[PDB]
Amino acid sequence: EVETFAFQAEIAQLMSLIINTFYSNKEIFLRELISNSSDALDKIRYESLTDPSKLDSGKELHINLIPNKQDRTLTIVDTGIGMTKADLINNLGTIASGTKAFMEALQAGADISMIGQFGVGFYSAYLVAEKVTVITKHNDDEQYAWESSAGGSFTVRTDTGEPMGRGTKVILHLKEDQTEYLEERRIKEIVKKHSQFIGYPITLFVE
Numbered sequence: 001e002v003e004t005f006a007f008q009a010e011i012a013q014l015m016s017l018i019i020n021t022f023y024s025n026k027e028i029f030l031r032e033l034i035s036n037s038s039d040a041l042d043k044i045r046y047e048s049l050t051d052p053s054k055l056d057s058g059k060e061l062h063i064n065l066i067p068n069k070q071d072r073t074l075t076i077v078d079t080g081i082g083m084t085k086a087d088l089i090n091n092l093g094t095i096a097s098g099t100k101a102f103m104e105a106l107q108a109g110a111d112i113s114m115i116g117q118f119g120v121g122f123y124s125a126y127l128v129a130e131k132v133t134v135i136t137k138h139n140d141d142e143q144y145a146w147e148s149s150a151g152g153s154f155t156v157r158t159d160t161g162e163p164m165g166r167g168t169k170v171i172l173h174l175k176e177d178q179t180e181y182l183e184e185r186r187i188k189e190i191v192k193k194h195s196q197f198i199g200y201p202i203t204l205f206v207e
């Protein structure tokens with residue numbers, strides 16, 4: 001039922017740097033996740049141009065932000081292109097993106113806020129999350145769950161959870177000390193500051 005993979009060496013090093021570097025400006029993780037969702041939405045919008053039945057799995061292109069204070073989770077959901085199983089394993093840990101360029105940049109005076117220039121911004125989720133779960137559904141495949149609490153490994157399984165139409169869900173199990181990012185005022189503040197021109201509706205769920 002569950003396959004366990006080692007991250008490629010430089011991805012493991014990147015995650016360790018993100019988890020262990022003292023760096024207080026953590027709110028930047030949201031912008032990076034929201035940009036990755038916007039890109040995934042662009043991709044399905046593009047393909048649906050030449051093949052309209054690609055949206056049989058849902059026409060609405062949007063991003064939802066779902067805080068849950070009981071579970072201590074912040075969930076970013078899109079109806080983007082999604083990923084196949086092979087896409088998931090290839091893009092989320094078995095390959096290196098500006099992974100090397102980012103880590104060399106940090107030693108030449110870049111700072112962690114610049115991670116998105118390097119195409120590895122997804123890993124800034126580890127500034128605020130002790131565990132990340134990615135649930136994804138591509139038109140070409142079944143629904144899969146990737147998961148990692150860092151420490152060098154991740155898992156992939158077929159997802160038995162709620163069948164989504166198509167897209168990706170990023171579930172952040174936040175660290176004990178990072179529950180500010182479940183607060184409605186805080187989330188609105190961050191989206192307004194960093195993601196205010198994203199070209200899809202961003203809906204902040206209430207509790």
Ligand SMILES: COc1cc(Cl)c(-c2nc(SCC(=O)N(C)C)nc3[nH]cc(C#N)c23)cc1OC
Binds near residue numbers: 036037039120121168
């Ligand atoms: C490890 O780096 C990534 C991780 C993920 Cl999960 C995604 C991603 N891909 C996808 S669909 C595939 C895609 O867009 N590729 C570029 C492969 N949708 C997403 N929605 C939120 C995302 C985030 N973070 C997300 C995209 C990433 O890099 C661009």
